[PDB]
Design a protein around this ligand. Structure first.
Ligand SMILES: NC[C@@H]1O[C@H](O[C@H]2[C@@H](O)[C@H](O[C@@H]3[C@@H](O)[C@H](N)C[C@H](N)[C@H]3O[C@H]3O[C@H](CO)[C@@H](O)[C@H](O)[C@H]3N)O[C@@H]2CO)[C@H](N)[C@@H](O)[C@@H]1O
Ligand SMILES: [Mg+2]
Ligand SMILES: [Mg+2]
Ligand SMILES: [Mg+2]
Ligand SMILES: [Mg+2]
Ligand SMILES: [Mg+2]
Ligand SMILES: [Mg+2]
Ligand SMILES: [Mg+2]
Ligand SMILES: [Mg+2]
Ligand SMILES: [Mg+2]
Ligand SMILES: [Mg+2]
Ligand SMILES: [Mg+2]
Ligand SMILES: [Mg+2]
Ligand SMILES: [Mg+2]
Ligand SMILES: [Mg+2]
Ligand SMILES: [Mg+2]
Ligand SMILES: [Mg+2]
Ligand SMILES: [Mg+2]
Ligand SMILES: [Mg+2]
Ligand SMILES: [Mg+2]
Ligand SMILES: [Mg+2]
Ligand SMILES: [Mg+2]
Ligand SMILES: [Mg+2]
Ligand SMILES: [Mg+2]
Ligand SMILES: [Mg+2]
Ligand SMILES: [Mg+2]
Ligand SMILES: [Mg+2]
Ligand SMILES: [Mg+2]
Ligand SMILES: [Mg+2]
Ligand SMILES: [Mg+2]
Ligand SMILES: [Mg+2]
Ligand SMILES: [Mg+2]
Ligand SMILES: [Mg+2]
Ligand SMILES: [Mg+2]
Ligand SMILES: [Mg+2]
Ligand SMILES: [Mg+2]
Ligand SMILES: [Mg+2]
Ligand SMILES: [Mg+2]
Ligand SMILES: [Mg+2]
Ligand SMILES: [Mg+2]
Ligand SMILES: [Mg+2]
Ligand SMILES: [Mg+2]
Ligand SMILES: [Mg+2]
Ligand SMILES: [Mg+2]
Ligand SMILES: [Mg+2]
Ligand SMILES: [Mg+2]
Ligand SMILES: [Mg+2]
Ligand SMILES: [Mg+2]
Ligand SMILES: [Mg+2]
Ligand SMILES: [Mg+2]
Ligand SMILES: [Mg+2]
Ligand SMILES: [Mg+2]
Ligand SMILES: [Mg+2]
Ligand SMILES: [Mg+2]
Ligand SMILES: [Mg+2]
Ligand SMILES: [Mg+2]
Ligand SMILES: [Mg+2]
Ligand SMILES: [Mg+2]
Ligand SMILES: [Mg+2]
Ligand SMILES: [Mg+2]
Ligand SMILES: [Mg+2]
Ligand SMILES: [Mg+2]
Ligand SMILES: [Mg+2]
Ligand SMILES: [Mg+2]
Ligand SMILES: [Mg+2]
Ligand SMILES: [Mg+2]
Ligand SMILES: [Mg+2]
Ligand SMILES: [Mg+2]
Ligand SMILES: [Mg+2]
Ligand SMILES: [Mg+2]
Ligand SMILES: [Mg+2]
Ligand SMILES: [Mg+2]
Ligand SMILES: [Mg+2]
Ligand SMILES: [Mg+2]
Ligand SMILES: [Mg+2]
Ligand SMILES: [Mg+2]
Ligand SMILES: [Mg+2]
Ligand SMILES: [Mg+2]
Ligand SMILES: [Mg+2]
Ligand SMILES: [Mg+2]
Ligand SMILES: [Mg+2]
Ligand SMILES: [Mg+2]
Ligand SMILES: [Mg+2]
Ligand SMILES: [Mg+2]
Ligand SMILES: [Mg+2]
Ligand SMILES: [Mg+2]
Ligand SMILES: [Mg+2]
Ligand SMILES: [Mg+2]
Ligand SMILES: [Mg+2]
Ligand SMILES: [Mg+2]
Ligand SMILES: [Mg+2]
Ligand SMILES: [Mg+2]
Ligand SMILES: [Mg+2]
Ligand SMILES: [Mg+2]
Ligand SMILES: [Mg+2]
Ligand SMILES: [Mg+2]
Ligand SMILES: [Mg+2]
Ligand SMILES: [Mg+2]
Ligand SMILES: [Mg+2]
Ligand SMILES: [Mg+2]
Ligand SMILES: [Mg+2]
Ligand SMILES: [Mg+2]
Ligand SMILES: [Mg+2]
Ligand SMILES: [Mg+2]
Ligand SMILES: [Mg+2]
Ligand SMILES: [Mg+2]
Ligand SMILES: [Mg+2]
Lengths: 271, 48
RNA sequence: GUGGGAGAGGGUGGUGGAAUUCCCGGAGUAGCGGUGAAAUGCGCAGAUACCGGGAGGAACGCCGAUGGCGAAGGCAGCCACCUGGUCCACCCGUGACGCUGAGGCGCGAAAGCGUGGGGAGCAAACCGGAUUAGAUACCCGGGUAGUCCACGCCCUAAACG
RNA sequence: CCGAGGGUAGGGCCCGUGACUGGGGCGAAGUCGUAACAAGGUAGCUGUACCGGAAGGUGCGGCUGGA
RNA sequence: CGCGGGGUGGAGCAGCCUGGUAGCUCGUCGGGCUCAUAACCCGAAGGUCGUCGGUUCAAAUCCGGCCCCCGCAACCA
RNA sequence: AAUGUUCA
RNA sequence: GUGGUUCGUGGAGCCAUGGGGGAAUCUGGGCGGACCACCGCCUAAGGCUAAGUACUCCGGGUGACCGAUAGCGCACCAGUA
RNA sequence: CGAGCUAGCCCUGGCCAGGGUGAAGCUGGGGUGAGACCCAGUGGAGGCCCGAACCGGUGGGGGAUGCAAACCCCUCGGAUG
RNA sequence: CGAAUGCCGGCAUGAGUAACGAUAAAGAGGGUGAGAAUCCCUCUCGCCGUAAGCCCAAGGGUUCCUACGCAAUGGUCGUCAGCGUAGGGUUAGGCGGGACCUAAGGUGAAGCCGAAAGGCGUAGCCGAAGGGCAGCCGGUUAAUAUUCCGGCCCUUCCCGCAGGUGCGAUGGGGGGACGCUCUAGGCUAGGGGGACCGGAGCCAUGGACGAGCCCGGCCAGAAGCGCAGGGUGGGAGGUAGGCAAAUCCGCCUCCCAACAAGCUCUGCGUGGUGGGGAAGCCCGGGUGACAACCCCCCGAAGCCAGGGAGCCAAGAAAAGCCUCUAAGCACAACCUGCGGGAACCCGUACCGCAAACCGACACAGGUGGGCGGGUGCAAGAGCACUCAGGCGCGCGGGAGAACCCUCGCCAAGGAACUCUGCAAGUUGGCCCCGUAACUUCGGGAGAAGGGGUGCUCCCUGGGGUGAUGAGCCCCGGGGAGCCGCAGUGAACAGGCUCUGGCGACUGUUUACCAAAAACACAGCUCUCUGCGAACUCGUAAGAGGAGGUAUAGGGAGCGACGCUUGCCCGGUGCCGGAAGGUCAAGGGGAGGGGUGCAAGCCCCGAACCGAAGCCCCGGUGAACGGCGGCCGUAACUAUAACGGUCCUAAGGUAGCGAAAUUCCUUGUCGGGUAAGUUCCGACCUGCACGAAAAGCGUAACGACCGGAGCGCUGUCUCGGCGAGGGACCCGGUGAAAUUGAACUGGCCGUGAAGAUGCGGCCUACCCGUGGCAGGACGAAAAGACCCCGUGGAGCUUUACUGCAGC
RNA sequence: UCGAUGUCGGCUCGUCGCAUCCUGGGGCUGAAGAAGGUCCCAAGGGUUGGGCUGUUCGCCCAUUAAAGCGGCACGCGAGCU
């Protein structure tokens, strides 16, 4: 839905925020070895190596389960659906019959009360994980793994998802969120359903700050700087690049493909 | 107005200290050069 | 009220095959395509033509009507679910409760507009090739918004019997 | 106290006028094309959308007051 | 004052560079189709090639003195 | 395959 | 490829190396300035080895060296204030 | 050799008188077939308003071997972000 | 040595000049002494009082206290001092640190990397204004005190002892434990009154013996005791988890019970009792005293605290502490009592918004935390006055010229000033009336324009606390009445409106000449990137990205929102093309050469097979980018819908247009003005607008830039008077740039072309002081501009040549 | 003159030149008068306030006897802006 505001103050006549009803029934994290001190920091060993990051509200890190073959067959009830500052997606706190509690990136549709489980035996329904091989071609899934046992790495952003296009050998063909067609091993797990909280792509930040609360500091334009700072910089009084559009490091930034050519990763791609 | 020198005992020790000067090969050379010139104070004398 | 009937009435979810296009594989060779005649264009980088595998979107052939449904706009593969109208019969119930309807409220093809999706074919604008004195057109080869969905708007018409 | 009026300040309605501008009516024989009336030689009409010296042209659907 | 570009039948453009030939489109003229006009068909006429000198055997064409033309630069303070 | 001055 | 040498690609050997191929043990093997052939030199892929040589923080001795703006930055409580 | 100035970021603490405006929610009333919606009441939102501390440095004047190698007076901008 | 703006030192000149450092302010009487405006005491006076007063951190290191002293240091003086000499002075189980814990980060066994130096880095260790932890009220010294002492109250360890229990980890679990904004109820700190309690005293000057005036009416405090709160369901069974070792967690299952109770844990009163105890008066001490030590009211931002509500940006760690079992050990061992004993190290002076810290200075600058009383004003930490407490700023005394600075007032006029209303005025708080276009419906709004405002008396409504009732406070409502020029009577305290330009908006910036139309910004588009992501740093290891996964992350441009964003893929870039052209090693060896008597050994070397790149083919604009000319033509003329032709990759669309763009140009009309090179509206031969280096608009916003009005003013006609601080004079102290030497006049000539200095002529006794700036081509800076030097740097690219990278 | 001679305009203070814009004398006149025109002598003293622009300069508005020209480093920044 997204909450909109009356225009009492500008920057807030455009501002809009998430429908937090989805979450509710729980704001406090499941402390139980669930959150960890999370180190902030826009740089590595001294130098900033990603520009314009910093500041941004204090943040606790919820550790979530991205490889569910741990508890194969051990079912669990969905305790709650909480808020995660560290992601676009919302998480779900799930108590296992085992007694062990874990977190999972909350799929769309999942509800407090439902039961869930991962395994080959597992029934094909929202929240359940299984190797792609045992998932019916056509079903939508999220939190897909890339190589087996390596853990989930695909379709985890709010409202994202992958769809099975069909098997072919030990591999199964997935159409990824981006839209690329990749062959992924059949043993790679993946939980059924879409990522959920798809209204996300619609929230309008609103003001200059807030972009700040999210830890994103101002991004200054190339042309605005000087010959020294960027290739675009310079020229007496406003100019048009004057070079084919380029990054501060000098590589062309409009259309120039960048992924490695001889990458073995290919052969399993097509899109 | 707020001037350049703002004395901090701990900062001074941790920066120009003896131990500090010892860790870095550059510093060890400082201690060397000074000791060899005859300085009475090899390091910024400061008491705590 | 009871007991029956017919229908593309409306919404939601699911699904079927033919066909167009694109992708992959196989085979195969100098044309294909287009027209009034051509040209642009596509094709020796292996096109057209034919076989096999795949993605995808849109539309529903034959039944099919000079038919049925709705108040209108309008509604056509098939399944289910949710639900609106309507007709017949029995002569049972209520007992004039009726008709129209200023204003109000609800609906309202197509085009067009917003937010997000989607995009095979088609196709305003737009670019080419001709035709013409001219050709900002009819023709041809391409092509974007649109057409498609969801939600929110627009409320017009030869909204015609 | 009220009080005709006078002042200052802000509003509402109407009339006159205004460089310039938009389209309309009207004026025997000016200019360009030929849309419509006969398949008006691209059936016409129409609401809507873009384009074009101009009438008009095309897309999408609707009409028969065309076949 | 500077750089270099254009001057040709009536219109707009060729040809000059590697001097000997002025070519295209348009129009203008006569003749056809029409009932007549346009389009179309047929066939012709039309150019001191800005001007004034010397190079040559020969000058649209090479060379310089002007003459309208067209552009570009004119700055530092 | 455009067109056909005006008033009778 | 390079480096070293007087040798800067030169006719460029020799002595070193990163990379590739890869022997033989005296009928073995390197060199004598591309390369061949003679003639001759020497024995690689393990190691050690005084003296003659270099310097002057230190002790001494001298000086056609200075003599407190000189001579060490300091003749003095100077690498101090 | 320097981030004891300045710039950015990281960890951990502190601070922001007093006024004003009065969003969303709720609660009751109204409305309708049910709604939309409209009222009051409560409520206390906001890189909102005024304005000290605090953070600045807009215009003018003074100062110019200064009080000061950037200062003073009046004025002025922000002030829960 | 005579010059090098030479080097070092000395001493001059300016000059008894500027200045003596905040315009908070001084006067006098006593002392002291060789000598006092300046030291000590007293009495007047003025200034501060969210301080110019207290307390703590940092830094400073003896300055602190006392006795002696004055050369120098205190911009004068100095008997004084932060100065000189000497001697004292800093006391802790509880305050703050360490024999505790962890943060960022640092270091760093293992482990990884790197010519060496060295770089990452696990465990561990280090790291604190954060966590954890036991001390209150008084009293003393010249100088210390939560440190010594008094009273009251705690903390660890060790021993003995009685009484208890499965005791026991560096392991498990719980916990510690956390945001922002808004808030309830009690409290407390703090403050105000009192007809009440205690007091020495005072009736002045016209009055008052007064329910008068004046002073003061508390602090701490175990257990118990109340009053507020914070925490918390009890049971009983199973169990696939807690890298299962558990009767502890966690999970299910099930009797009871729940806007609770009890159980716990704080806060606050209360408390045995200890402690403090003015004004005044007499010499810090006494006295005031065996001082009283009570009652109302206001009341926190603090306490109960882990209280509650709402919100999105979703808010440290570890130890102590509970609990659980492991080995083990059950003679251990822990637990509770109770007495005895034991209890280390470092800091403690003083300054601390400043004369002791950072600014070379006893420098109008800078410096984190807490307290910060009273009255009045709507409120307040604001403003005015004032407590406590602290100051009068380390040169003075006169004179009352110009001129300057800071300040007050002004006839008549009222922007005529000027680049410009620059500056100054006006307005100003609160209550009430009452308010337009336009808009994104919030706003514009404090629009504008107005009225009221003091005190006196009467009537009258709600509340809080009490108790319902009186006091005490908090909000009000209505009549009359008094006095001034004036009632927010002083101080704090908007001038307003109309119409343009630019950017949407709050915000950022050139520390020290630019605060802006610049940057950023939400938002739009393009592009890269399937995760060992792209991209960035690094030789590497490794790291950031990200414990993220395209609803994500990198790069680019545009820059809210509205309506929109045309045509040209010729060139350039980028994307796509398994064909061809070309192409390096390398493979391949037709063929040829050097030598040997030779087998040989050596050299060249064509066909042909050989990547990426370039070529070629095609796409591509919110990719670099680009988006025409010349003739003719209507039945008055003008003009040209229409036509011809040349060129192109295509010839600029909507919209805007003499503009932040228009040269000609003050374009031409219209508006405003008595007059308008600016402004607004029109037009359009746009020298040279135009669509994301976006185009045209837009409510609101702006210490942005332009044009008008009203109000109001010394900005001006046009200047006048007045005040304070300098200037001037006297006493004290006493600089600087500059300076070839000077005995340094005018004119007209002359001269290297602008003469005190040459020529001629003309004035002119010697020397100062207060003023003014025409000259000394005055000072200050080896001219920035300019040119030059085969000088230097920063920047660019289809300049050359390399290197990283790919 | 570059080991520096501050550059436009304005304001303030002027002084001079005179080829005279006023005001004084005067001769011609196609001078009737009143006017004017042109030349001659003569600066003693005069030679306004606004609108527009940085302007100098101009052009306007309202006046005037007239609203003169020009030099003084396009006089004057150790006088201001
Ligand atoms: N006719 C009146 C309205 O305006 C237009 O009509 C106007 C024009 O089309 C028309 O112009 C015509 C022209 O079309 C035709 N081909 C040639 C003719 N000579 C012109 O005629 C015009 O001009 C002449 C003077 O020159 C006048 O005398 C005459 O009245 C006038 N109509 O003149 C009309 C003015 O009245 C619309 N086409 C018409 O449908 C509409 O109703
Ligand atoms: Mg380091
Ligand atoms: Mg930016
Ligand atoms: Mg740099
Ligand atoms: Mg560059
Ligand atoms: Mg420019
Ligand atoms: Mg459907
Ligand atoms: Mg194929
Ligand atoms: Mg097939
Ligand atoms: Mg479908
Ligand atoms: Mg039905
Ligand atoms: Mg009946
Ligand atoms: Mg539609
Ligand atoms: Mg649409
Ligand atoms: Mg098509
Ligand atoms: Mg077509
Ligand atoms: Mg669109
Ligand atoms: Mg569908
Ligand atoms: Mg719809
Ligand atoms: Mg419709
Ligand atoms: Mg009008
Ligand atoms: Mg027709
Ligand atoms: Mg037709
Ligand atoms: Mg037609
Ligand atoms: Mg068309
Ligand atoms: Mg049709
Ligand atoms: Mg006719
Ligand atoms: Mg007639
Ligand atoms: Mg050997
Ligand atoms: Mg000697
Ligand atoms: Mg010496
Ligand atoms: Mg001597
Ligand atoms: Mg710092
Ligand atoms: Mg409300
Ligand atoms: Mg604010
Ligand atoms: Mg202010
Ligand atoms: Mg504010
Ligand atoms: Mg000199
Ligand atoms: Mg000297
Ligand atoms: Mg003086
Ligand atoms: Mg005072
Ligand atoms: Mg200290
Ligand atoms: Mg002295
Ligand atoms: Mg002393
Ligand atoms: Mg110890
Ligand atoms: Mg290290
Ligand atoms: Mg420690
Ligand atoms: Mg601590
Ligand atoms: Mg706690
Ligand atoms: Mg108290
Ligand atoms: Mg008396
Ligand atoms: Mg009291
Ligand atoms: Mg007590
Ligand atoms: Mg209780
Ligand atoms: Mg129990
Ligand atoms: Mg259990
Ligand atoms: Mg175990
Ligand atoms: Mg303080
Ligand atoms: Mg000091
Ligand atoms: Mg000091
Ligand atoms: Mg200084
Ligand atoms: Mg100071
Ligand atoms: Mg104050
Ligand atoms: Mg002083
Ligand atoms: Mg002083
Ligand atoms: Mg006056
Ligand atoms: Mg007056
Ligand atoms: Mg003026
Ligand atoms: Mg003036
Ligand atoms: Mg002006
Ligand atoms: Mg002003
Ligand atoms: Mg006020
Ligand atoms: Mg406004
Ligand atoms: Mg702005
Ligand atoms: Mg500003
Ligand atoms: Mg936008
Ligand atoms: Mg921009
Ligand atoms: Mg192109
Ligand atoms: Mg080769
Ligand atoms: Mg070979
Ligand atoms: Mg190739
Ligand atoms: Mg004509
Ligand atoms: Mg006529
Ligand atoms: Mg146009
Ligand atoms: Mg103009
Ligand atoms: Mg204009
Ligand atoms: Mg005008
Ligand atoms: Mg464009
Ligand atoms: Mg813009
Ligand atoms: Mg502003
Ligand atoms: Mg601002
Ligand atoms: Mg303005
Ligand atoms: Mg004055
Ligand atoms: Mg005076
Ligand atoms: Mg004196
Ligand atoms: Mg002279
Ligand atoms: Mg002379
Ligand atoms: Mg004098
Ligand atoms: Mg002077
Ligand atoms: Mg020089
Ligand atoms: Mg040169
Ligand atoms: Mg010069
Ligand atoms: Mg000089
Ligand atoms: Mg003059
Ligand atoms: Mg004369
Ligand atoms: Mg000056
Ligand atoms: Mg001066």
């Amino acid at each position: 839905a997204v909450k909109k505001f009356k225009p009492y103050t500008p920057s807030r006549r455009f501002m809009t925020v998430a429908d937090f009803s989805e979450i509710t029934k729980t704001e406090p994290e499941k402390s139980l070895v669930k959150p960890l001190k999370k180190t902030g920091g826009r740089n590595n060993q001294g130098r900033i190596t990603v520009r314009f990051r910093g500041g941004g509200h204090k943040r606790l890190y919820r550790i979530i389960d991205f490889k569910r073959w741990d508890k194969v067959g051990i079912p669990a009830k969905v305790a709650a659906i909480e808020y995660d500052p560290n992601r676009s997606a919302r998480i779900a706190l799930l108590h296992y019959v085992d007694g062990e509690k874990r977190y999972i990136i909350a799929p769309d549709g999942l509800q407090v009360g439902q039961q869930v489980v991962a395994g080959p035996d597992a029934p094909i329904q929202v929240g359940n994980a299984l190797p792609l091989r045992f998932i019916p071609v056509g079903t939508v899934v999220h939190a897909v793994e890339l190589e087996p046992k390596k853990g989930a790495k695909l379709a985890r952003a709010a409202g994202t998802s992958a769809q099975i296009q069909g098997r072919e050998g030990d591999y199964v063909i997935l159409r990824l969120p981006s839209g690329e067609l990749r062959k992924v091993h059949g043993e790679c797990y993946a939980t059924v359903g879409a990522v959920g909280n798809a209204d996300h792509k619609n929230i309008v930040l609103g003001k200059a700050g807030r972009s700040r609360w999210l830890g994103r500091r101002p991004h200054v334009r190339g042309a605005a700087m000087n010959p020294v700072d960027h290739p675009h910089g310079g020229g007496e009084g406003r100019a048009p690049r004057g070079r084919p559009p380029a990054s501060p490091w000098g590589w062309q930034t409009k259309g120039l493909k960048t992924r490695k050519r001889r990458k073995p990763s290919s052969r399993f791609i097509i899109a | 107005m707020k001037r350049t020198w703002q004395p901090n005992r701990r900062k001074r020790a941790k920066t120009h200290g003896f131990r500090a000067r010892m860790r870095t090969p550059g510093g060890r050379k400082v201690l060397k050069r000074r000791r060899q010139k005859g300085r009475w104070r090899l390091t910024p004398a400061v008491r705590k």
